[PDB]
Each structure stands twice: as C-alpha cells, then as structure tokens.
Design a protein around this ligand. Structure first.
Ligand SMILES: CO[C@H]1/C=C/O[C@@]2(C)Oc3c(C)c(O)c4c(c3C2=O)C2=NC3(CCN(CC(C)C)CC3)NC2=C(NC(=O)/C(C)=C\C=C\[C@H](C)[C@H](O)[C@@H](C)[C@@H](O)[C@@H](C)[C@H](OC(C)=O)[C@@H]1C)C4=O
Lengths: 122, 122
C-alpha cells in the first residue's frame, strides 16, 4: 500500500484555476474596488484571504455575486494581490509597495504583509 | 516578481480541501453508481479533462448533480477526489484496478501512469 504524493499537483491546480479565471469560466463573483470590477472564484479568494474567508463563511453572504470592498482600497494594489492569489507571484516595486501592504493587511494576507516588510529594506 | 512562493499553491489546495469537508461553496454532487460526492466544479475542472469538458458544456454546466458513466466504481472515485484536493494518491491492492479505470475515464493520465508502476511493484 502506497500513499504517493504528487509534488507539483498543487501548483498545477492553481495554474489551471488561473486559466479558468482568464477565460472567465465559473467565476461567480465580482469584487468592486472603488468602481473597477474584478471577476474571481469565491473559493480561491477564501483560500487566500482572511477577509474573504470571513465573508463567505457567512451562509447569508455566501451566494452574493457582488462584493464592494472598502473605498480606501485602491484597485492597483488589489489587482496585484488577486494575481498573487492565483499565481503565487508578487509584483513588488517601490512604486506600489505601500498600496500592496495596506491592501494585504486589509485582506488579512499576513505572509504577503511580511514579505512586503522584508522588501521595504532595500 | 521573479520569485514564486511555491508553498502558496499548497496552502490554497489545503484550504480548498477544508472548504470541501465543511461543505462550504460546494456546488456539485457527483454521482458514482449510487454514491454522492460533494465537490467544487472549479476544482474538478482544474484536475480532470473530463470535468473540464462537462462543466464547459452549457447543457451540463448548470446542474447541481452530475452522473458519471455507470461502470465507474465508487471506491476508485473517492480516491481520485481525495487526490484532487490533497495531492496524495492512496493506493491499495484492494482499490487499484478501479482507481486506474476511474483515472483513465477522468482523463487523468499521470495518475494512470503511477497506478501501472504500483501494479508492477505489487
Ligand atoms: C495545463 O493546461 C492543460 C490542461 C490541464 O487540465 C485541465 C483539466 O484543466 C484545464 C483548464 C484549466 C483549461 O483552461 C482548459 C483545459 C483543461 C484541462 O483539460 C482544456 N482541456 C482540453 C479539454 C479536453 N481535451 C481536448 C479535446 C477533447 C478536444 C484536452 C484539452 N481543452 C482545454 C481548454 N481550452 C482549449 O482547448 C482552447 C480553447 C485552446 C487551447 C489552445 C492551446 C492548444 C493550448 O493552450 C495548449 C498550448 C496547452 O496550453 C493546453 C493543450 C494544455 O495542455 C498541456 C498540458 O499541454 C491544457 C490547457 C482549456 O482552456
């Protein structure tokens, strides 16, 4: 009896999820940041973000197809964090470092916060 | 941005598996013989060519129940489902032929290749 672990499977799935997202397949939510719209899978959001996890665990909010993020959240930093959720890659530049950390703190992605803090420190 | 955080994909899959066991946002029942397996369509689709084709056909895309072909055995399907959500494929001499046959059906060819090696080791 063997329990075989496939070590790039998790990477393969997340990659596929991203492919479904870029074709807009089975995306079941629109996140509204200021007034820009991002389509996403609820399940991915919850799997990465303490905020979205909190929200969608509420059996009431669970079938909401629209979510209005707080208005201090800028769309640029959100889009970067959405890309990270889906790619495990974080586009960090001096120009965006601050908007990314604030958005991450807000989404409760604390490992993203702490790599932003590590970045800050050239 | 050159750096990827490979464990992230693993966190993501770990949390999707959590949602599944809590039955949060599961949106399909897969029916295998007379056995029901709750799941998320996105995850099935990201893991199986067959599921990708089913959930991408508009006549099938919007049903909460999907029946697999009658020949498919429930023990085999349960192992593949666990694999999709954990990356671990649990093979036993008691389950192997049905896992192979079920993985072939689901067009999961790397899992098929690993079953053949186990039978050769057995
Ligand atoms: C890593 O990704 C692979 C599958 C993952 O696994 C699955 C389970 O998750 C998927 C995800 C998340 C997807 O988004 C698609 C598919 C699958 C899976 O199957 C597809 N699967 C088929 C569905 C069933 N058969 C086809 C047959 C029955 C007609 C197999 C593929 N088509 C598929 C699609 N779209 C298309 O075909 C279209 C509109 C265009 C394709 C253009 C080129 C030709 C490709 O892009 C090529 C350069 C390469 O990228 C793919 C061929 C790649 O294959 C690999 C590993 O080289 C898959 C996308 C998809 O968008």
């Amino acid at each position: 009896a063997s329990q075989i672990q496939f070590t790039r499977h998790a990477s393969d799935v997340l990659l596929n999820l991203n492919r479904l997202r870029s074709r807009d397949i089975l995306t079941d939510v629109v996140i509204v940041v200021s007034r820009e719209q991002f389509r996403a899978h609820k399940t991915v959001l919850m799997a990465c973000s303490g905020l979205f996890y909190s929200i969608f665990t509420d059996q009431l909010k669970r079938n909401l197809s629209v979510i209005n993020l707080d208005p201090e959240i800028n769309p640029e930093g959100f889009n970067i964090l959405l890309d990270f959720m889906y790619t495990s890659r974080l586009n960090l530049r001096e120009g965006n470092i601050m908007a990314v950390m604030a958005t991450a703190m807000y989404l409760q992605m604390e490992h993203v916060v702490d790599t932003c803090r590590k970045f800050i420190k050239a």
